[PDB]
Enzyme design. Structure first.
Site, PDB file in Angstrom:
ATOM      1  N   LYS A  36       0.815  -1.192   0.240  1.00 41.93           N
ATOM      2  CA  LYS A  36      -0.297   0.360   0.280  1.00 41.93           C
ATOM      3  C   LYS A  36       1.279   1.375  -0.285  1.00 41.93           C
ATOM      4  O   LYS A  36       1.734   1.596   0.719  1.00 41.93           O
ATOM      5  CB  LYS A  36      -0.913   0.026   1.619  1.00 41.93           C
ATOM      6  CG  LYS A  36      -1.621   1.649   1.637  1.00 41.93           C
ATOM      7  CD  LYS A  36      -2.856   1.020   1.892  1.00 41.93           C
ATOM      8  CE  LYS A  36      -3.221   2.382   3.264  1.00 41.93           C
ATOM      9  NZ  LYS A  36      -4.652   2.139   3.835  1.00 41.93           N
ATOM     10  N   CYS A  37       0.846   1.887  -0.416  1.00 42.83           N
ATOM     11  CA  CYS A  37       0.995   3.758  -0.646  1.00 42.83           C
ATOM     12  C   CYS A  37       0.597   4.203   0.988  1.00 42.83           C
ATOM     13  O   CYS A  37       0.156   3.464   1.814  1.00 42.83           O
ATOM     14  CB  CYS A  37       0.160   4.511  -1.901  1.00 42.83           C
ATOM     15  SG  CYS A  37       0.282   3.924  -3.211  1.00 42.83           S
ATOM     16  N   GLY A  38       2.046   5.106   1.095  1.00 42.81           N
ATOM     17  CA  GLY A  38       1.794   5.931   2.388  1.00 42.81           C
ATOM     18  C   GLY A  38       2.350   5.898   2.823  1.00 42.81           C
ATOM     19  O   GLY A  38       2.543   5.968   4.503  1.00 42.81           O
TER      20      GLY A  38
END
Lengths: 153, 149
Positions: A36-38
Protein backbone atom coordinates in the site's frame (compact mmCIF):
# COMPACT_ATOMS: atom_id res chain seq x y z
CA UNK A 1 25.56 -22.19 5.68
CA UNK A 2 28.18 -21.45 2.92
CA UNK A 3 25.34 -19.97 0.90
CA UNK A 4 25.83 -16.47 -0.42
CA UNK A 5 23.18 -13.88 -1.14
CA UNK A 6 24.21 -13.90 -4.78
CA UNK A 7 23.14 -17.59 -5.02
CA UNK A 8 19.49 -16.54 -5.01
CA UNK A 9 16.98 -15.72 -7.75
CA UNK A 10 14.00 -13.40 -7.23
CA UNK A 11 11.15 -12.06 -9.38
CA UNK A 12 11.20 -8.49 -10.57
CA UNK A 13 8.01 -6.46 -10.88
CA UNK A 14 7.21 -7.92 -14.33
CA UNK A 15 7.18 -11.39 -12.67
CA UNK A 16 10.38 -12.20 -14.55
CA UNK A 17 13.18 -13.91 -12.68
CA UNK A 18 16.23 -11.85 -11.70
CA UNK A 19 19.52 -13.54 -10.94
CA UNK A 20 21.15 -11.92 -7.93
CA UNK A 21 24.61 -13.07 -9.05
CA UNK A 22 24.41 -10.16 -11.53
CA UNK A 23 25.14 -8.04 -8.42
CA UNK A 24 28.04 -10.21 -7.20
CA UNK A 25 30.83 -8.28 -5.51
CA UNK A 26 28.60 -5.26 -4.78
CA UNK A 27 27.07 -3.93 -1.57
CA UNK A 28 23.31 -4.58 -1.49
CA UNK A 29 20.66 -3.17 0.84
CA UNK A 30 17.54 -5.35 0.90
CA UNK A 31 14.34 -3.73 2.12
CA UNK A 32 10.75 -5.01 2.20
CA UNK A 33 8.50 -2.20 1.03
CA UNK A 34 4.83 -1.51 1.61
CA UNK A 35 2.38 -2.86 -0.93
CA UNK A 36 0.00 0.00 0.00
CA UNK A 37 0.99 3.62 -0.58
CA UNK A 38 1.27 6.16 2.24
CA UNK A 39 4.89 5.85 3.48
CA UNK A 40 6.34 8.69 1.45
CA UNK A 41 8.88 9.80 4.04
CA UNK A 42 10.45 6.37 4.20
CA UNK A 43 10.76 6.03 0.42
CA UNK A 44 12.21 9.54 0.42
CA UNK A 45 14.87 8.60 2.99
CA UNK A 46 15.77 5.38 1.14
CA UNK A 47 15.86 7.26 -2.15
CA UNK A 48 18.10 9.84 -0.42
CA UNK A 49 20.69 7.37 0.93
CA UNK A 50 20.73 5.74 -2.53
CA UNK A 51 21.39 8.98 -4.41
CA UNK A 52 24.10 9.96 -1.90
CA UNK A 53 26.14 6.74 -2.06
CA UNK A 54 25.50 6.59 -5.83
CA UNK A 55 27.42 9.88 -6.17
CA UNK A 56 30.32 8.91 -3.88
CA UNK A 57 30.53 5.34 -5.25
CA UNK A 58 28.71 4.88 -8.55
CA UNK A 59 27.72 1.25 -9.28
CA UNK A 60 29.17 0.19 -5.91
CA UNK A 61 25.80 -0.08 -4.19
CA UNK A 62 22.27 -1.26 -5.14
CA UNK A 63 19.02 -1.04 -3.16
CA UNK A 64 16.47 -3.82 -3.74
CA UNK A 65 12.94 -3.08 -2.56
CA UNK A 66 10.56 -6.04 -2.26
CA UNK A 67 6.86 -5.18 -1.89
CA UNK A 68 5.01 -7.00 0.87
CA UNK A 69 1.31 -7.02 1.68
CA UNK A 70 1.80 -8.88 4.98
CA UNK A 71 1.75 -5.78 7.28
CA UNK A 72 -1.78 -4.34 7.17
CA UNK A 73 -4.51 -4.77 9.80
CA UNK A 74 -8.21 -5.54 9.22
CA UNK A 75 7.29 8.74 -2.80
CA UNK A 76 9.02 8.05 -6.12
CA UNK A 77 12.20 5.98 -6.03
CA UNK A 78 14.87 5.11 -8.59
CA UNK A 79 16.39 1.90 -7.16
CA UNK A 80 15.07 -1.43 -8.47
CA UNK A 81 11.75 -2.46 -6.93
CA UNK A 82 11.08 -6.17 -7.29
CA UNK A 83 8.17 -8.55 -7.59
CA UNK A 84 5.85 -8.90 -4.63
CA UNK A 85 6.87 -11.55 -2.08
CA UNK A 86 6.11 -12.87 1.36
CA UNK A 87 8.80 -12.23 3.95
CA UNK A 88 7.16 -14.36 6.67
CA UNK A 89 5.54 -17.73 7.07
CA UNK A 90 6.23 -21.07 5.44
CA UNK A 91 5.30 -19.27 2.21
CA UNK A 92 8.14 -16.76 2.64
CA UNK A 93 10.39 -16.38 -0.37
CA UNK A 94 13.48 -18.62 0.05
CA UNK A 95 15.67 -15.51 0.00
CA UNK A 96 13.98 -14.12 3.13
CA UNK A 97 14.11 -17.49 4.87
CA UNK A 98 17.88 -17.27 4.43
CA UNK A 99 18.19 -13.57 5.39
CA UNK A 100 16.24 -14.17 8.62
CA UNK A 101 18.28 -17.19 9.83
CA UNK A 102 21.55 -15.51 8.81
CA UNK A 103 20.84 -12.36 10.85
CA UNK A 104 18.15 -12.76 13.50
CA UNK A 105 16.32 -9.69 14.70
CA UNK A 106 16.25 -8.41 18.23
CA UNK A 107 16.58 -11.08 20.97
CA UNK A 108 16.90 -13.68 18.24
CA UNK A 109 13.41 -13.09 16.88
CA UNK A 110 13.65 -14.10 13.25
CA UNK A 111 10.36 -12.67 11.84
CA UNK A 112 10.31 -9.32 10.11
CA UNK A 113 8.20 -7.16 12.40
CA UNK A 114 6.99 -4.43 10.03
CA UNK A 115 7.47 -2.90 6.61
CA UNK A 116 10.93 -1.53 5.79
CA UNK A 117 13.22 -3.74 7.82
CA UNK A 118 16.63 -3.56 6.08
CA UNK A 119 19.39 -6.14 5.50
CA UNK A 120 22.88 -5.14 4.33
CA UNK A 121 24.78 -7.56 2.04
CA UNK A 122 28.57 -7.22 1.92
CA UNK A 123 30.53 -7.69 -1.29
CA UNK A 124 31.11 -11.34 -0.29
CA UNK A 125 27.36 -11.98 0.04
CA UNK A 126 27.07 -12.47 3.81
CA UNK A 127 24.47 -10.53 5.79
CA UNK A 128 26.41 -7.86 7.68
CA UNK A 129 23.52 -5.89 9.17
CA UNK A 130 19.81 -5.86 10.04
CA UNK A 131 17.92 -2.75 11.15
CA UNK A 132 14.36 -2.34 12.34
CA UNK A 133 11.77 -0.26 10.50
CA UNK A 134 12.31 2.49 13.10
CA UNK A 135 15.99 2.90 12.21
CA UNK A 136 16.60 5.61 9.71
CA UNK A 137 18.51 4.61 6.51
CA UNK A 138 20.92 7.48 7.27
CA UNK A 139 22.29 5.48 10.20
CA UNK A 140 23.20 2.55 7.94
CA UNK A 141 25.12 4.95 5.68
CA UNK A 142 28.50 4.54 7.39
CA UNK A 143 28.05 0.74 7.53
CA UNK A 144 27.33 0.79 3.78
CA UNK A 145 30.42 2.86 2.97
CA UNK A 146 32.59 0.54 5.11
CA UNK A 147 31.18 -2.43 3.19
CA UNK A 148 32.07 -0.55 -0.03
CA UNK A 149 35.69 0.22 0.92
CA UNK A 150 36.13 -3.53 1.63
CA UNK A 151 37.34 -5.65 -1.31
CA UNK A 152 35.30 -8.61 -2.52
CA UNK A 153 36.92 -12.07 -2.27
CA UNK B 1 -15.08 17.30 31.30
CA UNK B 2 -12.77 14.72 32.90
CA UNK B 3 -9.64 14.55 30.78
CA UNK B 4 -6.58 12.32 30.93
CA UNK B 5 -4.67 15.49 31.85
CA UNK B 6 -6.61 15.91 35.13
CA UNK B 7 -5.02 12.84 36.71
CA UNK B 8 -2.05 12.58 39.02
CA UNK B 9 0.09 9.44 39.07
CA UNK B 10 3.06 8.24 41.16
CA UNK B 11 6.52 8.43 39.64
CA UNK B 12 9.30 5.90 40.24
CA UNK B 13 10.23 7.62 43.52
CA UNK B 14 6.49 7.94 44.33
CA UNK B 15 6.35 11.69 43.88
CA UNK B 16 3.15 13.28 42.67
CA UNK B 17 3.22 13.59 38.88
CA UNK B 18 0.53 15.81 37.40
CA UNK B 19 -0.44 14.65 33.94
CA UNK B 20 -1.42 18.29 33.26
CA UNK B 21 2.27 18.87 32.57
CA UNK B 22 1.66 17.05 29.26
CA UNK B 23 -1.52 18.97 28.37
CA UNK B 24 -1.99 19.33 24.61
CA UNK B 25 0.37 16.47 23.76
CA UNK B 26 -0.13 13.01 22.34
CA UNK B 27 0.40 10.32 24.97
CA UNK B 28 0.70 6.53 24.79
CA UNK B 29 -0.05 4.68 28.04
CA UNK B 30 1.41 1.19 28.51
CA UNK B 31 1.26 -1.03 31.60
CA UNK B 32 4.71 -2.57 31.86
CA UNK B 33 6.01 -5.75 33.40
CA UNK B 34 6.90 -5.74 37.08
CA UNK B 35 9.55 -8.46 37.15
CA UNK B 36 12.62 -8.55 34.91
CA UNK B 37 12.76 -10.41 31.61
CA UNK B 38 10.31 -8.76 29.18
CA UNK B 39 12.98 -6.97 27.16
CA UNK B 40 11.41 -7.41 23.71
CA UNK B 41 8.45 -5.15 24.51
CA UNK B 42 10.52 -2.37 26.16
CA UNK B 43 13.06 -2.06 23.35
CA UNK B 44 10.29 -2.23 20.75
CA UNK B 45 8.35 0.59 22.42
CA UNK B 46 11.45 2.70 23.03
CA UNK B 47 12.25 2.19 19.35
CA UNK B 48 8.92 3.61 18.20
CA UNK B 49 9.31 6.45 20.74
CA UNK B 50 12.77 7.49 19.53
CA UNK B 51 11.33 7.45 16.00
CA UNK B 52 8.32 9.74 16.53
CA UNK B 53 10.64 11.75 18.81
CA UNK B 54 12.89 12.60 15.87
CA UNK B 55 10.03 13.43 13.49
CA UNK B 56 8.05 15.52 16.02
CA UNK B 57 10.35 16.41 18.93
CA UNK B 58 8.28 16.97 22.12
CA UNK B 59 4.85 16.12 20.66
CA UNK B 60 4.79 12.51 21.88
CA UNK B 61 5.17 11.00 25.36
CA UNK B 62 5.27 7.31 26.25
CA UNK B 63 4.25 6.57 29.85
CA UNK B 64 5.12 3.18 31.35
CA UNK B 65 3.28 1.96 34.46
CA UNK B 66 4.77 -1.17 36.06
CA UNK B 67 2.23 -3.73 37.23
CA UNK B 68 2.76 -6.99 39.14
CA UNK B 69 -0.82 -8.16 38.50
CA UNK B 70 0.06 -10.55 35.66
CA UNK B 71 2.23 -13.59 34.91
CA UNK B 72 16.54 0.57 30.19
CA UNK B 73 14.45 2.99 28.09
CA UNK B 74 14.26 6.81 27.74
CA UNK B 75 10.51 7.45 28.06
CA UNK B 76 9.24 8.15 31.59
CA UNK B 77 8.53 5.16 33.84
CA UNK B 78 6.14 5.78 36.69
CA UNK B 79 5.45 4.27 40.07
CA UNK B 80 4.02 0.82 40.46
CA UNK B 81 0.24 0.65 40.16
CA UNK B 82 -2.64 -1.76 39.95
CA UNK B 83 -4.38 -1.79 36.61
CA UNK B 84 -7.39 -4.07 37.49
CA UNK B 85 -9.75 -4.63 40.41
CA UNK B 86 -11.17 -2.27 43.04
CA UNK B 87 -7.51 -1.43 43.89
CA UNK B 88 -6.79 -0.08 40.40
CA UNK B 89 -5.34 3.37 40.15
CA UNK B 90 -8.03 5.99 39.30
CA UNK B 91 -6.38 6.63 35.93
CA UNK B 92 -6.86 3.00 34.85
CA UNK B 93 -10.39 2.90 36.23
CA UNK B 94 -10.95 5.91 33.92
CA UNK B 95 -8.98 4.68 30.85
CA UNK B 96 -10.74 1.29 30.99
CA UNK B 97 -14.33 2.58 30.99
CA UNK B 98 -13.52 5.28 28.40
CA UNK B 99 -12.12 2.77 25.86
CA UNK B 100 -13.38 -0.78 26.46
CA UNK B 101 -11.76 -3.90 25.08
CA UNK B 102 -12.78 -6.21 22.33
CA UNK B 103 -16.34 -7.18 23.24
CA UNK B 104 -16.93 -4.51 25.85
CA UNK B 105 -14.60 -6.25 28.32
CA UNK B 106 -12.83 -3.46 30.16
CA UNK B 107 -10.08 -5.13 32.24
CA UNK B 108 -6.51 -5.28 31.00
CA UNK B 109 -5.74 -8.86 30.01
CA UNK B 110 -1.94 -8.91 30.10
CA UNK B 111 1.18 -6.75 30.29
CA UNK B 112 1.79 -4.06 27.63
CA UNK B 113 -1.77 -3.07 26.69
CA UNK B 114 -1.53 0.35 25.01
CA UNK B 115 -3.86 3.38 25.35
CA UNK B 116 -3.39 6.35 23.01
CA UNK B 117 -4.37 9.80 24.36
CA UNK B 118 -5.11 12.66 21.97
CA UNK B 119 -4.16 16.29 22.51
CA UNK B 120 -7.67 16.86 23.89
CA UNK B 121 -7.06 14.32 26.70
CA UNK B 122 -9.61 11.73 25.54
CA UNK B 123 -8.73 8.13 24.69
CA UNK B 124 -8.58 7.68 20.91
CA UNK B 125 -7.43 4.03 20.81
CA UNK B 126 -6.68 0.87 22.77
CA UNK B 127 -4.55 -2.10 21.64
CA UNK B 128 -3.77 -5.38 23.39
CA UNK B 129 -0.32 -6.93 23.99
CA UNK B 130 -0.46 -8.79 20.62
CA UNK B 131 -0.34 -5.55 18.58
CA UNK B 132 3.07 -4.21 17.56
CA UNK B 133 3.94 -0.59 18.44
CA UNK B 134 5.06 -0.09 14.81
CA UNK B 135 1.40 -0.55 13.83
CA UNK B 136 0.37 2.35 16.10
CA UNK B 137 2.57 5.01 14.46
CA UNK B 138 -0.13 5.88 11.90
CA UNK B 139 -2.69 6.82 14.57
CA UNK B 140 -0.07 8.62 16.67
CA UNK B 141 1.18 10.82 13.82
CA UNK B 142 -2.46 11.51 12.82
CA UNK B 143 -3.15 12.70 16.38
CA UNK B 144 0.01 14.86 16.33
CA UNK B 145 -1.09 16.74 13.18
CA UNK B 146 -4.40 17.37 15.00
CA UNK B 147 -4.41 20.62 17.03
CA UNK B 148 -5.04 20.75 20.78
CA UNK B 149 -8.41 22.12 22.13
Amino acid sequence: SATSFFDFKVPDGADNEVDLSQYKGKVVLVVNTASKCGFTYQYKNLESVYQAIKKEYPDDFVVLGFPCNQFGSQQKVTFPVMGKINVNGDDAHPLYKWLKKEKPGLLGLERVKWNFEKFLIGRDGKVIGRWASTTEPEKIQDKIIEAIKQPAP
